[PDB]
Each structure stands twice: as C-alpha cells, then as structure tokens.
Amino acid sequence: SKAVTRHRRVMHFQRQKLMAVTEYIPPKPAIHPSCLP
Amino acid sequence: GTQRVCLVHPDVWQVAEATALVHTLDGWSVVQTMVVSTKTPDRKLIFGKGNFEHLTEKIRGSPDITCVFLNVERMAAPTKKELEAAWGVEVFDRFTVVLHIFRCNARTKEARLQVALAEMPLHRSNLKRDVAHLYRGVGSRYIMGSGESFMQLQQRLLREKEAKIRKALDRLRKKRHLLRRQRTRREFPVISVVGYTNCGKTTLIKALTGDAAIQPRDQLFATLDVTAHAGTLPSRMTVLYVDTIGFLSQLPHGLIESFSATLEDVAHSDLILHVRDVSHPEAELQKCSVLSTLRGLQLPAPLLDSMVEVHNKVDLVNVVPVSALRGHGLQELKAELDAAVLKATGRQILTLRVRLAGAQLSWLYKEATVQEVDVIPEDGAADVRVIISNSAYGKFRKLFP
Amino acid sequence: KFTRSRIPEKVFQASPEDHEKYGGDPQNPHKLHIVTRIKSTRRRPYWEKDIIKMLGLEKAHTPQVHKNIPSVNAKLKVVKHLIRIKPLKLPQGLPAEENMSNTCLKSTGELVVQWHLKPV
Amino acid sequence: KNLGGKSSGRRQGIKKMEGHYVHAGNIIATQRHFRWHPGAHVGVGKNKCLYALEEGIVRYTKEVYVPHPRNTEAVDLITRLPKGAVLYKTFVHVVPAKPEGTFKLVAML
RNA sequence: ACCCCUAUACCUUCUGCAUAAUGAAUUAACUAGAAAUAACUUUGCAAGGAGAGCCAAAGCUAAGACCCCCGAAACCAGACGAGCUACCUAAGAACAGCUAAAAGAGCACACCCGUCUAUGUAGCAAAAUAGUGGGAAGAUUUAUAGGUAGAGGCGACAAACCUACCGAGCCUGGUGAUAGCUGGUUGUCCAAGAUAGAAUCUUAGUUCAACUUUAAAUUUGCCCACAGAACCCUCUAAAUCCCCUUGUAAAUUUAACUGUUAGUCCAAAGAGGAACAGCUCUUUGGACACUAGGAAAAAACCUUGUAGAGAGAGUAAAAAAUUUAACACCCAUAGUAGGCCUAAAAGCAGCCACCAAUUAAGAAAGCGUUCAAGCUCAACACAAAAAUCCCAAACAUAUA
RNA sequence: GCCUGUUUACCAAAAACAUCACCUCUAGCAUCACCAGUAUUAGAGGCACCGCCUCACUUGUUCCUUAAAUAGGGACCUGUAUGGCUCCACGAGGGUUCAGCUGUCUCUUACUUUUAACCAGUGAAAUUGACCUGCCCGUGAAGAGGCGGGCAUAACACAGCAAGACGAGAAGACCCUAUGGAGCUUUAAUUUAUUAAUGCAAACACCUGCAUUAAAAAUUUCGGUUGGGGCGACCUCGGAGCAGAACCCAACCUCCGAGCAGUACAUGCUAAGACUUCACCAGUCAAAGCGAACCUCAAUUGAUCCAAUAACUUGACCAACGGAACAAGUUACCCUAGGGAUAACAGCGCAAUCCUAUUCUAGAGUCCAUAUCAACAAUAGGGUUUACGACCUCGAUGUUGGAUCAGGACAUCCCGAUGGUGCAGCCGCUAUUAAAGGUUCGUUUGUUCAACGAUUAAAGUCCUACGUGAUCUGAGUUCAGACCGGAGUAAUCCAGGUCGGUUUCUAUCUACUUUAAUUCCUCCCUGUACGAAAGGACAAGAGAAAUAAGG
C-alpha cells in the first residue's frame, strides 16, 4: 500500500494511540457561562 | 483524437458529404481526396489492380495520411485486412465513421446505450484484433477447465454484453411508453419531424415552437435524442413537435435501427413532417434514403402515407417552401399543419351553443381549443367555434345535456 | 526511510515552569544521573540497543549512576524513551570509606550513607 | 523499448575528509566533474581525481575562482559576470606536516 | 480415575504447517560420514629431523582430529527367446442345413471374431460372463514341425506384434551407472550462530565476496564535539559520511574451515500495477524463522527477553466509542399594462432605467399565465443488504 | 469408404490399411530369394472398382421437413482452389427420417431368482501417526472433530446413506523445471568407420592403399531472463532520474546513448603512494627519477587456450558480449526425477471490470429534477462476470453440462400487506414490508446459455468445490487411431471442423435415516362501481379443480 491511498489507511496501533492521546481538549469554563448573569 | 484522413471515394457531392462527416469529428482533417472509378464494387479489393496499385503508391507516398476513409457503406473483413496491409494505415468506412461520430456526440444514457447496440457489429468484426493481446498461447493442452477455447470464450462474452444491452434497451422502450402515456391521454397532437441528416429539423422546430434552449448545430448528427417541444398553431391548438435523429444514405440499416427504442415515438406520432433539404444537390437521393429508412423502422403505413413534406433551406435557392433560419414560409406551414392535425387526430371544428352558466364555457376552454366566442345576451348564451376531439365532444355531451 | 532522529535543541532547554514542576534549580545543577531502563530494547533500532549496552542498562529496573556531562547526556538523549532519568541526591554527602558498606539508594533517589534498618 | 541504464555506481566521491592524515600520492577524492577543485599540494589526474602531492592534513576551504586566461569558457563566464561578483569554489588542501628535512652532523672533520 | 484449569502429535519441507502438504498400523532385528593438502594439539630430536629416497632461513619425525545411505528413466557388450504373437515354409484337417448355382454369393449351425449394452473392476478372468452382433467355401479357421532375433525380426502402417508391463524385448555384466532432484541421515549436555553482492548454458546449483565458527597476535573498535563534504537548480526531506571527548570493550590482523546465498509481514521513502491485492521490485529499520505475556484463535502488531526450584512480590503491554433533522403568524391598495420589445408580451421571453403615491409594496425574489388573470415572498400593522446458525453472559449510579 | 477383407491382443474396427482397376519409376538377366522365372516378366511405389471429364469448396438469401430445428435435406447468389465429378451394390461406419413397437419416459408398480439380513462352518484386501473421533460462527498454511467464543453431550451395539474425513488407490498422465532421458524429422553440429561408384597408385578383370562423390546411417545437442510457460522483447558498456545530502542500491522501470572518431608519434622507460563498479579477473590516478621537449572524448570493448610472426606484435558484432572449438526442430507414442518454488479447475486476496443504493439538480418526462428516469461527477455497499496475484493442494483437491436430492441469501418473478402515480376502471410502473409456499413441458444444439412452440399466477437473481461423478451419465472439452482446412522440408502442430475412444472402490470415523398447504379458474356481486365511449373492477359469498403432505 502506498503512502497516499484512495481510502483512509489503517494506522499502526501506536500511531492510533498517539492520535487519541494528542486530541484537542476544549477549555472547560468551570461554571457554564449560559446560566451566569 | 487527431486524425489526418485521405478520402478515397469509389465511383460506379458524395465527396462533399464524406468531407462533412470527417469534419464532424472535431479533430479529423481531410488531407487528400481520391475519386477513383471501379466496375466491381464487391471484391476483396474494391478497385481493379490497375487503380489499386496507383492508390497504394499514392497513399504510401503521402506521409500526412494517418488513416483512409473509404466512402463505402461497409467493407468486409477480408477487404479491410487487405487494404490495411497494402496501404499501411488504418481504414475507415461510412459505418465506422458514422459510428465514431455517434459515440462522440452521444451524451444521454439512452443515446450511449443505443450507440453501443449500433457498435456491437463493429465489436464482432474487430473481435480478433481486440483480443490478440490476450491469447497468451493457452489452450488445447491444459487438461482441465471448461471446454470453451479462447475465441469461444471471447465470443460468449461479446454475446452476453449484447444481450445485456438489448435487455437495457427493452427496459428503455418500456419507460418511453410510460412517458408517452400522459401526452397520449391528454390528446396532444404529435408531429414527428424526420428528414435527412443536417436538413434543418432542429432549426425548423426552433422556429415553430419559439424556444431558445434549442441549439441547431452545424455538424452532422447533432441531435441524437428524440425530444418533444410544444408549440402553438394559428388555431390556438398546442402541437408537440418531436425532434428525431437524422438519416444518412449508404449506411447500414442496423445502425439507425439500433435507435428504434427512442424512435418509436415517431410510430405513435399523429403526423410526420419530412424536412427536405431542397437546396442540397441530391435532395432526391436523400428522399429515397429517408423513405427507405422509415420503412425499415416499420412506421405505420397510414402515418407514412399522411406524411407531409416541407422544403427547408429555400432561401439558398402542392407543398410549402420554408426557410427555418430566415423564417419565410412558417405561417403557411403552420396553416397546413393545422389542417393536417384536424384531419388526422379526428378533431372536429364545430360551432356549439352553450348556456352562459354552469361553467360549460370554462369546461370547453380547458378541454378544447375555443377558436372564438360569439355571445348572444338576449338569450344569455354563447355560440363557441371550437376545435373539439371526439372524446372531448362525448364528455361534453354527457356532462351538459 | 526510518533513520536516526535528531532531537531539536529547544527540547532540552528547561523553562521556569519546568523548574517549578520538577524541583530543580538551573544554577547548581546535579552532578550524577540515576538511570533505569524501563523499556525493552527489543523492537528498537540496533543503535539504541548499542547505546543501552554502552550505558550498561541491559537489565531493566536496575539503577545505574552516570555523569551529568554533555557526552553522556547525548547518549541519554539518544535512548531517552527507554530510560527513566533522575538526579542522584546525597542528603548526607558523598559516602566515605568508613560508611561505604552501609549505603543504600532509596526509591526517592537519595543515597543514604547510613542504613540501620531500624524505626526512626 | 528502454535498453541500457544497467551501469553500476562509480564509487566516486571523497576518500579523505578534513583532518585526515594523508601520505603523498593518496587519492583524496574521485569525481566525474569538478566538484572539489585542487588546492595547495593537491594534484589533478587525467580523470579529475584529486591526489595528495605532499604528506599532511586535508582541509576543505572556499576560495575565489580565477580561471586560466586561456580557459575560454570560464573567461567568457567572467566577462558576462556583473561587476562586484566573485566566483567561489570548494578547494582541497594538504597542509604538509613533516619538514622537507633536517640538517644532521655527519662528520666532525 | 474422570469431573476443575492449561495444552493446535511427530518428522521432513517451507517465508510460514495442527494443518485438509510428505512418511509412518505396531513390535523385534538390520539399516546410512570412508580421506588427502595445509593447519591445530601433544610428544621426540633440533640447525637439523627422519630407520637411504624427503623436508629444512626452527625445522622435522610420530601421533591425535578430517568429508554418508536408498532411488531413476537411461547407454553399451554378450547371451536367451518366433510352445504367445507378426509373417512365412512343409505336409494335414474342419466348414451342418436352406436359397442359389462353378459366386473373395445370401440366410444360418459348428467354428473364428469381438459392434453395442449390462454385470464384473483384488473379478470366474492381470481383459471374463450374459445377451446382442460381423464373418462363417474363403484374402477363411485351425492342429503339427520348421524359419526370420533386437543398430534386429515381422507388419493388408495400428509406430501393430515379437512369452501378460515394446517409441523398441528379456537375462546377465560394465554397475554400488549418474542424478545440481526427492527421501532418509541413529547417545547425553553446554556454548557461538539468520548479514550486502558479483560471475556463471546461471538463477532448484556452484566459486568468490558478505555473514558465521574456532584458535592465535596486536591495538585500538563502537558511541561520536566543533570544523568539514557542488554547482547544475530558484527552493527543497528524514538523514548520511568524517569525527576528538565521553560511556564502553571490543576491534583489526594471522591460521583453518564449513554452512547460509528459491524469505515473510510491519513502519517509513519510493517505483510498477489501478494512489488493487496476503501483488511485485529497491532502500532504512523492526519482528518472525527462538522463550514468554497481550491483541479472541494468531510466525510478521504491542510488552518482554539469557534460561533452575518456590504454594512470595512489584509491574510491562493489555477492555472501544458513539444516537444524530418540528417551526413562523398575519398581510397586500396602487402611478401603470415603466419604456423598447414584439401579435401581445402586462413584476415576471429579452434590453435599458429601476423612480414613485398611500403610514406601509422590488417597475418584482420564486410559481402561474399565449397574453392576462390567480398564488406566494419581500413591506406595513402585532443510510444501506448474501448466501449452514445472531453470537460470551450481562451491566448505566459505592468514592483510582 | 467402391465392394469381400485387415488393424491398435488389454479403452479407438473406423472415414484408417489393404483391395481388383489404373498410373509412375527401375531392371536385358540364370544355379540358395527374385527364379529353377526373362519386358504380356520382376521389383519399388502412388491412388483406389467401373463410367464421364480434365468443374469442385466458400459469402449471403430462400424452400422442404417439425407446432417449434444451432439438426437433416434442396436450390440460387458472391469469391477461392490429369486430379475432380459420378453411390450401382455393400457397411455392427457417421448423421436424418415415416410407420410400428414398446417401462426409454409421463410415473412407477407387482412378483420370481440372485444378492441381501439372521443362524452354523471356513475365512481375505486396500487402509491404518495416535485418537477419549460432535454442531455453529470466527481464526489460521487462506475450505477445522482437535484453535477462540458459544451450543450440545450417560454407555454401547445392528441395518441403511454417501455430505465431510481436502476419503483409499496409483511419488499427477495436464503444466513448469533438470546443462535428466528416449522416439521421430531434418537444408542442427561432427564424421564416412560401412557399402556403391568412379579417379590415381600397386599388379600385370579381381584384391590392396589413397582420394572424390552419393546412399545409407552413426554420436550428440537443441541457451537463459520471464508476474507460470509460449509468442514478442532482452542479454555487454556509459550518462541522468527512481536513489534531493559520503558510498552503494531492483525492476520485462522512465529517458538518452556506445561498439567510434580525431590529433599527435617521448601515445618513451621507470617508479613512491593511492583508487576500484561491492569477490576474483579486469579497470583507474600518480609524486619522484632517467630520457625528452622548452593526448580530446562517458561508454567507444573480449580472458585462457590456440593460430600467424624471426621478433615486436595481430587475430572472434566468442553481441547468449567472464567467452563450450565445432550441435536445430518435434513428441498427444512419450519416459524418469521433482515442483503447489510454477500454470490449468477449485478455494483465497483485490475490486480495475461488473452489479446495486444514495447525493448533486443539469437534462428528459407537453409545463414539472424526484410518477418514471437521468449526463458530468461524489459517497457508499456486494463479491455472481471478465481479470490480476500465485497463498493451500502436482508421494492427485477428478473437469463443463445433465440426472437425483436439494441447503441457504433476498437485491421478490408469482401469491400476501402498504405508499405514490403521468392511479377514471382493466392492465400497469415505481417504492416499503414479506423468503411460509411455488417458480412448466417441448424442437434444435453437450450446451450451461441462446432462438423458437405452447403454457403459467410466475416460469426470479444468486451462493452452496461454477453444490452434488466413494450416488449416476459421459455428448463436448481433454490421451493414444483417423480424416478435412491451415502452418511446416519433415517429424509434427493449430484460439478451425468432425468420427471413435476402460467412470474403480466391500464405509473405519463424523453427519444423517418417521418434525395447522398453497394456487388457479367458473359463477355471483356485475356488464355493477368507474368510464364519453371502448373496456371493465374490487371486497363478501358459492362451486370446481391442480399441486404438496399424510393415509
């Protein structure tokens, strides 16, 4: 299989773990701003 | 793609027609013309050896010739093989050239399917050459497997492909009947515009209907789809003109008959309009070709008999002479078309007295073409001159005693 | 192609936040590393295998003392993903000849020079 | 259609990098074109290979390029160069280590 | 004892075998590494050694150690075969009955053959039985004796037949033929040990190289700081070479050898294919061809490796997550059917302008009209499916 | 094919071989064949009686035959090609056919004998790693009794069955390989030892020696790479990408080129030290010195031996280019050693091809994307086609169809329910749900298919080792025989046509062996609803049948 595939090539499990661990974590704003004056 | 062609015309105008066919390809250029006489059209070499050697030396001396277009309806396999070997270039006939332009211009799925059916004979003829690169010298010594040989398997595959194409075309014919159901039920008069290739059918339909989306091209076989466009006659009656595919002479009947699936709309037409290209030198030969093509298509005999004729392209130079581009005889032609549809669709132009109440007048407007209304207020009624079909007349008689 | 990895130098430039987190003053740096192999050299390149052998970290979870000098640091950078590096701490100072037989390397990284094995 | 291209690698290039002790006659670098130009105490063979003309240490430097006036192509390139421009090339040098010799007392006449 | 938990016979071959690849029913017995040159070790003697010959610039003498089994189709020589069969020679024999008449005549016995079917297929039979069928006074069938013998004979040529297996008989001998091919290659224990290519009638093999093993001599071996290694080309990758220190202990050389040189997947840079293949081809690296744990079972993924006993302990990798589409309500007079355009084209076929009245309305954003008309709107007002039968059971809330 | 006859004993009995007749060639002669013969003779051959000539076969159209014909027969029409037409009789030869006949079949049944089962006597064979020998799904050396997850599970005989144990049998006959064989053919290489001629010698025609020419033979070979093998292409050397930066890197990978030329005659001799195409061989650079003056080009070539030469030196497009001194074809007459390292069937990977569904809203559909479709394209799903790969199997996984029995999926052909419609009704089209049940008989052709005839409610698409040959058939394909057309000098071969051609197995194990029906049609509703007419319904009810199951 080439580096560029027409389909999403399966990642090596370690690469998958890397991508899962380095996912974007949004900032949790403690108290939800919606229900603050 | 790009092809420089030598137009080799056997002889026993046509050169101009073949040149137009070549120009239609958008990448094919005639770089030489050779009108050669012969007394034996049917032979392995169409020309006697005396002319054949001269043609061969001329063709091989000219280096710009990428191919040769032999203006013959269809050349046999031995003839093609011998000519190819002698002239060292590809050989094309009327069948192959027309088939190529059909494939190029075909855009709709229906057109592609029909041109595939038309191609089928070409594929059968070129089967040996198209599979010569797959033989691999396997057969008759491998002791296991289906008994079919290489050529037998290839022929079986070709037959299966043809069967698939024919099944798809039968489904297409059923769907075309389904589409025609509604127009038939509502009793729209249908006029099928037939004629020789490039004679102005599309231009005439554009002139009659007034539509702007219609694009009459300059190349041959521009229209490959049978399509219906509505128009209005002087009697305020709406008539549906069916633009069809043009016909060509000295061409195998099977090529055009492969379009019968979509051309069956012509059979169900109420009238047929033959667009004669009077300005063309060979208008008589074109008439013979189109009439023979229609008979081969098996159009109804009453319809072919009632066929009207219109002489288009009269500007360049018992019937109605018309000029589609200039729009000269269009009003007259519309008058004769009105008369023809009245006498063909069984529509009676009659005066009818109706009480000016109960929505009878509105019913007549919506179910018939009210030519005029003369109202008598003293009796509170109206006499309508209306073109009404038999079905509409019966409905009115029952609904409003 | 998979090749040896050149670690950018900016990786090994500690920040004040790193100093606060890990408890190490940029001035007065520690002298010795306690290095323990916490990862197998199997499925790793032969150069990493060789560097591990050179550092003498063949046995896992076996602390080894090394100099905190640029060359040893370069080797440790090469094999940094297979090892745990901590600063060797000497609360009672360097062991002397008298107490050389009573030393012990506590899990905290401190080389205590008196090991009585008695309650405090 | 494509025939040939089976030639193997010439195994050319630098044989002595900078700082390498080199004895007289050693080939420093083999090249098909003039990648590294001969410097002090470095000679060129017929096939453009650089060999050490003296025993010493190899040093690679960048030095201005001044072709021989009879090298027509290089002189034309220079003639077309804009003013202020100076060509540079990589030169290979052999810094001789040992002295040519020593004066020794041979006889106390 | 079983029930509990763990456990995919062995050998060979292979990249990889529980493999549904080979061999093996099992017991007993038999059944397969022969050796020179040069080296190595140990003695003797020593510028000499040796029991003539030979060697010698520490050699020489002696000893120790050192290289398998079965298997072809074949080829040639000499014998033996024509009691089967092919043909021929000598002298013999058989051919009912009927029709016809001196018949390579017809029907049809004996007789000879073997068309078709069934049975049989380790059979009654290494070619048969039953029925059916062809010939059956002839080029017929057959008894007896003889002849032609293999680079041959004989042949109404089917490459037929020649003593059951004739593209060339059989036996013996050369012969233990040869086989780069397959199979086999028998006590215990420990250790080192998977690694670029070149040439080759060569890619099923071999020689050299590389790798590997042993012994010996010596000193640098690996990791690697600066500095350094090209323009063509305007820009441009991971990196590489070289390399003191440093951490380490290996490296080179000498002597003597084999064996591996038909390889798999994974990550990455690419090429071919179709940006298919558990596809093929190079490069860097890893793993497997070795142990163990995990990913379900699992050669190639992850963890982990140097080996024993323990009814101790800390850990490594190691368990998937997800559930997704409501929505405005009211209201509409009108410069005029704005001009041109066209039969008319009227907000709506096209072009120009796109102002303007009513508090509030585009010279009209979509339908609809041949054209109109009628409808609104804008404006006011308030995700999937295939074939034997889904696939642990389950579980949302007890403090990492 | 003239006929009677002959033949592959043991798969082919024939159209093949022979055959009278005819034709071609050779020979003028006796004491072992021919021949105890003598040109009306003998031998070696070709073809096939006789008779007529020196027209036959191919391209299409058509007629008869059948209800239906790729079958059979007969015409005409286009081009190819002194050995072509003519069937009298005959034929276990190959096709077609009237009529009859009949269990061939619709559609099987009854009985007798053998076999069989039980009792008694006698008593094998292949086979066999050990077996304490289950099913489903998944996995895996790519198809599990043994592995993972489930399910099932007291132990045993006896009789049947043939789905599996890639079942037994033959170290696969197919295919490839081996510097393994053999048969045959040759204008393959090398010879003429042997015969027959001649010529020259020797002797005075014969014999002997030496040459030349033929016949006959003999020995030996028939390269490699290769996405299996064949065909085609290629085989050595150099430059550039792939391989961006020390070196090195494959490809039947992309492109370029070379097999010289030119100039000089110190293009002399020597000699440190280095490079090196990953070995060796070979190939490179070169200080200093003597002697002199004051080599360009990337490749531009080839070893040993052996020949020529007094010597120096020279000699192969030895291009299969590390080079055999000199050797080709064919084998289905084949053989042996192996190979699943390598092909054909199958499985498996893949999905280019193929099939299917959605998305876009161009375009058809009179207007109207969306009743039905649908271009350019996008996203998905399937594993039924044509392919590609070569992963299991070559110490055998038996092959296309058909019979028999069928298991399964639903992407439904019919029967059921429902939505839309360009649904007035009847016919329909489309879509959702539904796999309980069903899904015909015939002519031609081996046909799976296809065309045609008559039906049906329908004559569904597939998978199951292209389900099913230890249940069957062998018509084709695909052995050995033989023709016709083509290729070749021939042997022989051919993706051309055809006639004939051995179908083994007693069951050890697993598995299994007695489990509320559908549909059509007739009548009535009703000639009603609907419809202008034509035509023409549902629902409910009654009656008839057919099939299937059980008796």
Ligand SMILES: Nc1nc2c(ncn2[C@@H]2O[C@H](COP(=O)(O)OP(=O)(O)OP(=O)(O)O)[C@@H](O)[C@H]2O)c(=O)[nH]1
């Ligand atoms: N001078 C002239 N030209 C005309 C006239 N009518 C038609 N033509 C041309 O004839 C050609 C025909 O174009 P179409 O009308 O599209 O052709 P068609 O008849 O549909 O035929 P196909 O192209 O075969 O489909 C075009 O070049 C027209 O312009 C006429 O009256 N006068």
Ligand SMILES: Nc1nc2c(ncn2[C@@H]2O[C@H](COP(=O)(O)OP(=O)(O)OP(=O)(O)O)[C@@H](O)[C@H]2O)c(=O)[nH]1
């Ligand atoms: N070096 C070399 N040797 C040759 C050449 N030609 C022939 N030979 C030698 O001769 C052998 C070839 O023998 P042939 O082929 O018979 O030679 P030929 O010259 O063609 O013919 P004969 O003279 O009959 O041998 C080679 O192997 C060499 O031993 C050549 O061009 N060069």
Ligand SMILES: [Mg+2]
């Ligand atoms: Mg047109």
Ligand SMILES: [Mg+2]
């Ligand atoms: Mg190259």
Ligand SMILES: [Mg+2]
């Ligand atoms: Mg086995």
Ligand SMILES: [Mg+2]
């Ligand atoms: Mg095997």
Ligand SMILES: [Mg+2]
């Ligand atoms: Mg066995």
Ligand SMILES: [Mg+2]
């Ligand atoms: Mg006899």
Ligand SMILES: [Mg+2]
């Ligand atoms: Mg008699």
Ligand SMILES: [Mg+2]
């Ligand atoms: Mg007789």
Ligand SMILES: [Mg+2]
């Ligand atoms: Mg024969």
Ligand SMILES: [Mg+2]
């Ligand atoms: Mg034969």
Ligand SMILES: [Mg+2]
């Ligand atoms: Mg015998």
Ligand SMILES: [Mg+2]
């Ligand atoms: Mg042997």
Ligand SMILES: [Mg+2]
């Ligand atoms: Mg070991």
Ligand SMILES: [Mg+2]
């Ligand atoms: Mg341990």
